[PDB]
């Protein structure tokens, strides 16, 4: 329980999840072409959200 599975369940799994998420979000290539393509996706998504919300 204590040295294996409670550690595997709450704290180590939380730390593993957040480490994976921060790697996935900070895996940027540093290319402003990709950054502006992402910005275009954001613009399109905002327009779609406004158009469906009305």
């Amino acid at each position: 329980l204590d040295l294996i599975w409670l550690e595997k369940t709450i704290p180590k799994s939380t730390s593993t999840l957040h480490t994976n998420m921060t790697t996935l979000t900070t895996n940027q290539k540093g290319l402003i072409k990709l950054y502006f393509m992402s910005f275009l996706i954001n613009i399109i998504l905002i327009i779609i959200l406004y158009s469906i919300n009305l």
Binding site: L1, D2, L6, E7, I10, P11
Partner: protein
Amino acid sequence: MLKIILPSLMLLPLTWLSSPKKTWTNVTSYSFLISLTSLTLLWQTDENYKNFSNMFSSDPLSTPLIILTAWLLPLMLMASQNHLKKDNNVLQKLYISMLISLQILLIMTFSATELIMFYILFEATLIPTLIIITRWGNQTERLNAGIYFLFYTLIGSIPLLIALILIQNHVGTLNLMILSFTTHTLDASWSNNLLWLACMMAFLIKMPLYGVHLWLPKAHVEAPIAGSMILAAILLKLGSYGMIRISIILDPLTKYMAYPFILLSLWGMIMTSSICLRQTDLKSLIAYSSVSHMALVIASIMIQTPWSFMGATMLMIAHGLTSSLLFCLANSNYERIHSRTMIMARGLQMVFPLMATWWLMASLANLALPPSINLMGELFITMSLFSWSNFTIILMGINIIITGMYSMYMIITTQRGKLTNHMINLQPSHTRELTLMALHMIPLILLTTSPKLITGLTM
């Protein structure tokens, strides 16, 4: 309350303005005087509560915790002033400042009349114990222990803040007496269940509940002696005090919502007592014993019986005293042999007879020898739990058997047996640490003599 808070505040300029050859003496003496001043809160000749101000009040529950904190501050100074002799003067004064700030904030937390101020002082107490554990701890794992402690407490306490703001928006003031008088019965919806969990999980984390208790053993192992004392003797009781304070506005759905936590408490006290039976580290053993005792306190507060509340208060005070005493004895052995291994030092009864007497008395307090307040709290918790359900006596009996087993196992493997004669560095005894053991044991004797002081709110 201000007459206790203000000179405890003035302890910090005393610490930073005293001579380096007089700092420990002055701060210890004036903290003893602070505790003597704090003894005036026991003057309760009426059924009323000593509401000193609009933000400070005294209680039959809050008063023993305040007195215990004020009494533990000089004992923490005496315990910690040996492993800081080879230390810088400004770092020593900073450590004393951390202890004094802990005492001030804990007194304010117990005397708070408003739950948002209670939460602010809760986190305010969260800070300097983290600083103490991280900075003056010994091994490498103190950083991981501090992270575990800090973020278990924070992830617990954030929904508590959300719930407190919700209750403040719904009612208007978040004042304890106003809530106690204009309590409204919840309609038992999913929103109210989530509100209940939000306002209880912080205190359950800091108690600690079983399954979420993993921060406690490493924090107590890696902490210095004063940090272990303040943790195991005040902060878990702070969680219990928060549970008692917040449980008044959770009717009626605590009746069925208490079910998983009672089971967690009972089976977790059995499991942690088994860990104490098979544990190779003395401070880990004491920490898991603390987990089991606080599991008993959790079960009593969950079942919400007047006998349970009284037993919870008595077990809080008794366990704080005996756990601080056990940690101080273990720290004396650790400062001797520079190890925390359970089996390394064995025949210490031969070399340290009076310290072996203190060990024996501390363990007899731990296994609830009558007529001590340990047995008073444990017995009344057992009575209330058996009233709640007759089948809880099996879990209680197993826990009592394993409790006596690990306590006497600790005594036999640390004092009895043949002496480890290779330990040439066994200094006889310090009058300071013998005084520390006496200052732990004597209040246990006095509270055993008069148990009416620590009965609490219900009786």
